[PDB]
Specification:
By secondary structure, this protein is α+β, with helices and mostly antiparallel strands. The protein is built from three helices and six strands. The PDB classes it as de novo protein.
Length: about 110
C-alpha cells in the first residue's frame, strides 16, 4: 500500500507547513527516507538543506491542487508563498531509488507578487 503511505505522509507534510513548523517537516522527510532534493535543478544534499531553504525563505502553504500516484513515483502540485510576497506553483515528484531512499524533484514556477 505505497499509495496510502504517500498520502498520509503528505497530510503530515502540508499540515506542518501550514503551521510553518519546519522542524516537523525535517522529521517527516527523515522518517519517509527522502535523502536528497533537487529544486529547479539546484542540489540540496540532504533534508537539512531542504528545510534550511524552507526556513530561510519563510515558505508558506496556500493550496493543494492535485496528487497522482504511480509505482515508486508520487507527484503533487500545490501553491506556496515566500516571506517576500512571491507566489509559486510547485510540482514535486518523489522518486523511489533502488536502495529504497527517495529523491524529491521540485519545480517552482513564479506566479507573481504584489
Amino acid at each position: 500500500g505505497e499509495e496510502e503511505r504517500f498520502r498520509a505522509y503528505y497530510e503530515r507534510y502540508f499540515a506542518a507547513l501550514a503551521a510553518r513548523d519546519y522542524e516537523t517537516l525535517l522529521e517527516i522527510l527523515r522518517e519517509f527516507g527522502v535523502a536528497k532534493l533537487v529544486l529547479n535543478g539546484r542540489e540540496f544534499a540532504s533534508p537539512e538543506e531542504a528545510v534550511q531553504w524552507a526556513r530561510d525563505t519563510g515558505l508558506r502553504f496556500l493550496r493543494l491542487i492535485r496528487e497522482r500516484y504511480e509505482d515508486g513515483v508520487y507527484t503533487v502540485e500545490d501553491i506556496v508563498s515566500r516571506d517576500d510576497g512571491r507566489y509559486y506553483r510547485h510540482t514535486s515528484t518523489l522518486r523511489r531509488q533502488p536502495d529504497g531512499s527517495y529523491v524529491q524533484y521540485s519545480q517552482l514556477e513564479l506566479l507573481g507578487s504584489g
